[PDB]
C-alpha cells in the first residue's frame, strides 16, 4: 500500500521527482479549504508552498500525516506547534533561496549606486538626462556586511571580486571562521564608521529589529549606500528617509518592509532609494530548488532515515524519557552563551546519571539551538549541526557518564573558548511536574527555576552589594523573584543571579554596574 | 582473474576475513628469502608483519604489486621510498595498538608505584618482606602527560578515573581541544614542577629525542614516578639512573630503550625501576586489530576506493602535474607553523593560476603533514586528516582561484590562529628542473630556494641590523647562502630570512636576538 | 587495578627476564582490557571504586552483590547479575569485600 | 648582462625579477646597490657593517647564491647614495667582481 504525498500548492511533478516511484503523488487546490480538508485524510505527507495554510484544522483532519513540507524558507503558513503537538515532522528548504537572495542584494546595491530605475524612467519618458546622473564606484571601497550567515557570506564573496574590501559585524561567527573567509570582524560601531557600502544580512529576532536606527545612521560615513534585502525593519524606515533627504546617506535599496504588503512608504517618494516588492527569492531557480530540496527531505523522512532539514521534533524521533530535557538543554545553551565573554568555539554537553542510559544526541542540537537563538527564528527547534559548523565555525559534542554527583540526572553544558577557557552551566528536571532547574554555574551550586528574566552580575566590590543591588532594582519598581549569590572561591570577585518580573532599564543597569563595580552584567530571558 | 593477496608473516585467515571472497589469499614464509622472492611475482597485494623485510629486491621482483600492508604501526621493515618510487601504495595500522599501549603505560605506572615485580620476587624467594615496601597512592595527585596524541589522551582518561588531576604538555594540540578533554595545557617547565606522575607519549623525532634530560629531571618534584612506554630515549637513561639512585625520582617504568634489543642497561640493576621488553603492543587483541585494520585498507585499495590509512602516494593517486607540488606544499606547512605564534586552528591552502585546473586535494594533506612534522615520523607522507582534526583540533581546506597575480601558478598556505590572525607563506615551482621556491611571506615577495637551514628573525632595532646579524653569524663560522630582508610596511619592525649552511648555536642566537632586539627568532630546516 | 594489569601484562616475569639480561620479548603475550567484560564480586566501597576505575578502561562492568543499592550500582555503570551469570560472562574477575560482610561465600 | 622585470598586483608595481640568471623580487625604484662577490664567511656582515657605519639605511635587500661557483649576488635598496670611498671599501672587503649603484626613480 503505497504512501500518499499530497501537493497542495503549485509544485510541478518534475520539481518533485526526488520522491521515488514508491509513493502515490496527488495534487489539490490548497487555498480552497473544502478541497484541502477532503483530500488530506489519506495523506502521509503534505507539501505546500506559501498559499496553503497548514493550521490545526488541517492537522486534526489528517490522521496519518507524518510530514508537512514547506517548499521555501518561511514557516508563517504552518502552525509548527500544533504539528509537533501531534508528532508531525515539519521541514522547510532552508538554503534554497541563498543564491537568489545574495544576487538580489548585489542587484539592489548596483541599482542604487548607479540609479538604474530613475535613469531607465527618464529614457522611458523619451528624454535624455545623462548629465543629471552621477553614480558611485565600488572598486577599492570598504563594504560592511552586517550579519555573516550563509547569504551575507555569498554577498561578501561576490562584492570582493569587485575589488572592494570586506568587513563584517557578527558576534555569532568565530574569528577563525571570518579569517578563513578573508573577512575582518568588527564591532558594529567600527563597521559604521568605515563602510562606504552597507548590506544587512540579519534574521529578524528582537535582538535584531530596528538594529540600524537613527543613532546608527548618524555614525555612518557621509555618502554611504545602504542595502537591506534581509528583513523588514532592520533599518529604521523613517530614519533612513530622514538621512536620505538630509543627504547623509546617498542611496539605499530595500526589498523588504516593516510591514508588507507595503504600498504607502515615504521611501517610495524618494528617487535615491531603490525598492522591490520582496523579490529576493522570486526566481524560477529558487522556487525549483525549494521544491527539489523538500522532495528529498520527504523521501528521507518516509525512508525512516534522518532528516537534516527538520524544523521540529515529531514521531519516534525522541523517547518520552528524553523529550522534556530538550527545552531545558536549550536554555543551558542560551545561558552558556550569555555567560561567555565571546562566542565559544564549541559546546561540550555532558549527560550524567540516569539520563545517560538514553539516546541523547538531540540534546547536543538543543544546546546549539540555545547558544544561537539570537540568530534563529522562533518556529525552528532543531538546527542542522554540520551546516552550522561549516557556516559559523562552532561545533557541539555529547559525552556520557554513568555517575551524576548529586541529582539522579544532570546535564552540563561546557562552552569552550578558543583560548581554552570554559564556562559551565548545569540543569536537571525533577518532580511530578518535571520542573526545569538550573543547578550549577561555574562550580557554584544552587536550585533556580529555568524561566523568566534573569539578571546575572560578576562584580568586585562586595560588602553591602546585596543591599545596593536589591535597592536599585526595587527603586526601579522591579520585583526580585529568586536569587543566588556567592563570593568567588578564589579572588576579589563575586557573582549573583536574580530572577526578575521585568527587564532592567539601561540607566539602572548602568547604576548597578557602577554601584558594585561590575565587570559583567547581563540580562537574559529564559522563557 | 581474481587478484592475489600474499601474506608473508603470521596473520590468520580469520584475522584477514575483511578481504572479500573476491581475492585469492596465499601464504608464504616471508623470513625465508628464496620462498618470498618465488611467491611475490604473482602478488597484487602483500601483507607483512615485522618479520618480513620488504626491500627493493622484493619490490623489483613483484611487477604487479599494488599495496604493501604492514599489520602494525612501525615501518622499519618496509622501504617506503622504493615503494613510492615504483607506484606502490604502502599502508599500516596506525591506531591498532592504542588501547594496549595506554593500558601498558598504566600497567607500568601502577607496577612502579607499588613495586609489584620486587614484591612478587620476594614471595617467589619464599620470604615475607611486607614491612619493606611502601607504595604511592594516585588519588588526588597531579599527573603530567607529555604528549597528547591518541595514546596520551587515553592514558589521561584512565588516570583521571583514579581521581588524579591531569595536566599535559603538547604544543601540537589546540587549547580548545585540551579544554574539551578537561585537560590543562602547560609549558613543559610547569608540568615538570607540578607533576607527581609523568607519562611520556611523544613520537621519536629529533625535536623529541632525549627531551627529558638531566636538566629536566632536576626540575621535577621530589618523589616523582616517571613512565615511558613511548619511544626509547625520550627520558635520558643515564640521567634517570642518576636521579633514581640519588633518590629524587622515586620510581620509573620503561617499556622502550635507547637501543633494543637491550640487555645491559644499568637501569636493570635498579629495583625501583620497572622494565619490560617493549611489550606495549604485545597483545592478541592488538595483533588481531593490526590485521583486521590492514585487511580493510587492502580491500579499499583493491576496490579503487580511497585509503585513509595510506602512508605514501602510489598509483593514479596523483597526476604528474600535481605530484611535484606535494613536497613544496609540505614545506609551506612547516614554514607557516614556524612563523606562527602558536598552533593555528586551521590551514587554508589557496591554489591559484594554472595549477588550479588540477585535482589538488592531496595538497591540503601535504600542508598538514608539514605543519605537524615535529610529531610525525619520517616514513609517513600522507596523514589521515579527519583523524588529525579529531585528535589534535586542527583542520585544513583547499580553495582554488583561476588567477595567480604574478607566477603562472602559486600555492599560498594561510595558517589561521584562533584569534583570527593569519600567517601566509607562498611557493611556486618553475623551470626545466621545477625548482621549489618560497615566493611570499606575509605580503612580502621574494624568490628563495625551499631548502636547507633557514633562519628567520622579526626584530625592532633596524639601522646596521644586516651588519650585526651577518657579522655574528660569520664570526660563528656560519655561511650565509641566500637572504631576504625588508622593513615592515607599517610599524617599527623588520624581518629577515637567511639560508645558512649549518645550524646556529644557542648562544649566538641569543647574541643575535640581543643585537637587533628580536621579538621572534627561528631556525627551520626545509630539507 | 595494579595487580590486574600486572597479571594481564605479565609485568613481574617480563621485568625479571630483563634483570637476567635476556631479551625475551617474543615470550610474552598480554591481554587487552578495552571492550572486555569485567566481573566485580562484592560491592563494598573498594569494589565500587574498582568498578569505576575499570570502566574508564572501556570495559563493561557486571557485579554480584545482592545487598547493594541497585540505584548506586547503575550510577557506577554496573550491571547487577547473579553470581552464575557473572562467572559465565566475565573476562576478568576482581573479588572484593561485599556490601554485607561477611556472609560472603567462597 | 641580462636584466628582467615584471609588473603585477592592483598597483601594477614594477619589479626587478632577474639579473644574470639570479632571481629576485624587488621594486624598480630608489637607489639600488648591486654587488656580485665571493661568498666567504663574514661577507654579508662586512657589506652591512660598512653601509651601517656610513649611515646608509637598507630598505630591502635580497641575496642569492650563484648556481655554480664561489660567487653570490645581492641587491640592496638604500635610502641614499654610497660615497665612492665607501664603495671602494665595500668592494675590497668582499672581492667584488662587480659593484654598482643605480637610481631607479
UniProtKB/Swiss-Prot annotation, chain D:
This is D-3-phosphoglycerate dehydrogenase. The gene is serA. It comes from the Bacteria. Catalyzes the reversible oxidation of 3-phospho-D-glycerate to 3-phosphonooxypyruvate, the first step of the phosphorylated L-serine biosynthesis pathway. Also catalyzes the reversible oxidation of 2-hydroxyglutarate to 2-oxoglutarate. The chain holds residues 424 to 528 of 528 of the full protein. Belongs to the D-isomer specific 2-hydroxyacid dehydrogenase family. Residues 32-104 form the ACT domain.
Amino acid at each position: 500500500s503505497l504512501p500518499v504525498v499530497l501537493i497542495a500548492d503549485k509544485l510541478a511533478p518534475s520539481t518533485v521527482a526526488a520522491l521515488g516511484d514508491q509513493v502515490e503523488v496527488r495534487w489539490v487546490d490548497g487555498p480552497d479549504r473544502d478541497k484541502l480538508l477532503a483530500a488530506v485524510p489519506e495523506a502521509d505527507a503534505l507539501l505546500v508552498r506559501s498559499a496553503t495554510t497548514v493550521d490545526a484544522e488541517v492537522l486534526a483532519a489528517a490522521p496519518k500525516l507524518k510530514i508537512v513540507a514547506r517548499a521555501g524558507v518561511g514557516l508563517d503558513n504552518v502552525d509548527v506547534d500544533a504539528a509537533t503537538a501531534r508528532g508531525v515532522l515539519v521541514v522547510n528548504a532552508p538554503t534554497s533561496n541563498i543564491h537568489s537572495a545574495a544576487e538580489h542584494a548585489l542587484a539592489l546595491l548596483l541599482a542604487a549606486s548607479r540609479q538604474i530605475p530613475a535613469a531607465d524612467a527618464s529614457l522611458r519618458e523619451h528624454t535624455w538626462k545623462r548629465s543629471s546622473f552621477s553614480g558611485t564606484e565600488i572598486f577599492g571601497k570598504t563594504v560592511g556586511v552586517v550579519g555573516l550567515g550563509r547569504i551575507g557570506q555569498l554577498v561578501a564573496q561576490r562584492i570582493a571580486a569587485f575589488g572592494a574590501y570586506v568587513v563584517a559585524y557578527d558576534p555569532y561567527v568565530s574569528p577563525a571562521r571570518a579569517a578563513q573567509l578573508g573577512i575582518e570582524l568588527l564591532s558594529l560601531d567600527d563597521l559604521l564608521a568605515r563602510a562606504d557600502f552597507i548590506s544587512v544580512h540579519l534574521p529578524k529576532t528582537p535582538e535584531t529589529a530596528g538594529l540600524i536606527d537613527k543613532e546608527a545612521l548618524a555614525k555612518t560615513k557621509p555618502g554611504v549606500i545602504i542595502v537591506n534585502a534581509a528583513r523588514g525593519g532592520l533599518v529604521d524606515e523613517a530614519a533612513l528617509a530622514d538621512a536620505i533627504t538630509g543627504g547623509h546617506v546617498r542611496a539605499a535599496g530595500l526589498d523588504v518592509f516593516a510591514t508588507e504588503p507595503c504600498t504607502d512608504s515615504p521611501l517610495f517618494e524618494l528617487a535615491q532609494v531603490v525598492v522591490t516588492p520582496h523579490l529576493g527569492a522570486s526566481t524560477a531557480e529558487a522556487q525549483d530548488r525549494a521544491g527539489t530540496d523538500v522532495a528529498e527531505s520527504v523521501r528521507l523522512a518516509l525512508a525512516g532515515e534522518f532528516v537534516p532539514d527538520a524544523v521540529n521534533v515529531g514521531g519516534g524521533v525522541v523517547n518520552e524519557e528524553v523529550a522534556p530535557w530538550l527545552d531545558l538543554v536549550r536554555k543551558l545553551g542560551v545561558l552558556a552563551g550569555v555567560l561567555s565573554d565571546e562566542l565559544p568555539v564549541s559546546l561540550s554537553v555532558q549527560v550524567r546519571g540516569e539520563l545517560a542510559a538514553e539516546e541523547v544526541e538531540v540534546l547536543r542540537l538543543s544546546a546549539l539551538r540555545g547558544l544561537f537563538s539570537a540568530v534563529i527564528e522562533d518556529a525552528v527547534t532543531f538546527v542542522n549541526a554540520p551546516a552550522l559548523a561549516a557556516e559559523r565555525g562552532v561545533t557541539a559534542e555529547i559525552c556520557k557518564a554513568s555517575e551524576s554527583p548529586n541529582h539522579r540526572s544532570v546535564v552540563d553544558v561546557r562552552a569552550v573558548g578558543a583560548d581554552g577557557s570554559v564556562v559551565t552551566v548545569s540543569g536537571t528536571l525533577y518532580g511530578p511536574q518535571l520542573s526545569q532547574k538550573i543547578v550549577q554555574i561555574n562550580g557554584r551550586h544552587f536550585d533556580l527555576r529555568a524561566q523568566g528574566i534573569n539578571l546575572i552580575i560578576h562584580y568586585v566590590d562586595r560588602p553591602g552589594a546585596l543591599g545596593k543591588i536589591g535597592t536599585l532594582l526595587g527603586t526601579a519598581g522591579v520585583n526580585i523573584q529568586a536569587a543566588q549569590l556567592s563570593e568567588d572561591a578564589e579572588g576579589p570577585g563575586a557573582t549573583i543571579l536574580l530572577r526578575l518580573d521585568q527587564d532592567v532599564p539601561d540607566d539602572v543597569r548602568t547604576a548597578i554596574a557602577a554601584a558594585v563595580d561590575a565587570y559583567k552584567l547581563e540580562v537574559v530571558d529564559l522563557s
